[PDB]
Ligand binder design. Structure first.
Ligand SMILES: [Ca+2]
Ligand SMILES: [Ca+2]
Length: 160
């Protein structure tokens, strides 16, 4: 059988850490936010542990912003019933996220609680728009139990 599975999705760029409106292109000198989801398979043989997002800049000049402050530079939200129920995304406790790395060209965030089958996490990441070269970021999802990584690339058009 398939014991455990995870998935990743890009949701594109937004003008706010939470809520707000979509964006892209972005004018150089403005902040913007990437969002990614990590999604636990509903058929998983149990909760998944060490669910980790690794995002690296692959092309262009934009930078992950700030020092790594939850609620300013990044946010992790949990939808405990995923798409399968009406519960909405809500920010998780600060203690529930370990910032493994936070720098201008790479960020790594680990969810410390276990992630129930079907549940999803939404990661929002603040960035500084820089260039008229596009910025492309690589986002990798892994967990202990799932045969990761699962990778996407999202691209932002920067106006000089
Ligand atoms: Ca839900
Ligand atoms: Ca985009």
């Amino acid at each position: 059988p398939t014991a455990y599975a995870l998935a990743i999705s890009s949701l594109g760029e937004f003008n706010s850490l939470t809520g707000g409106t979509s964006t892209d292109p972005v004018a150089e000198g403005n902040d913007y936010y990437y969002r990614f989801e990590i999604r636990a398979w509903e058929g998983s043989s149990g909760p998944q542990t060490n669910v980790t997002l690794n995002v690296t800049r692959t092309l262009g000049n934009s930078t992950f912003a700030g020092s790594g402050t939850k609620g300013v530079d990044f946010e992790v939200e949990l939808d405990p019933d995923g798409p399968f129920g009406p519960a909405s995304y809500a920010p998780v406790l600060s203690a529930d996220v370990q910032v493994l790395a936070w720098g201008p060209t790479g960020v790594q965030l680990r969810y410390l609680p276990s992630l129930a089958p079907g549940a999803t996490l939404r990661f929002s990441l603040r960035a500084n728009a820089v260039n008229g070269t596009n910025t492309t970021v690589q986002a990798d999802a892994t967990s202990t139990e799932a045969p990761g990584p699962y990778t996407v690339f999202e691209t932002t058009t920067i106006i000089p």
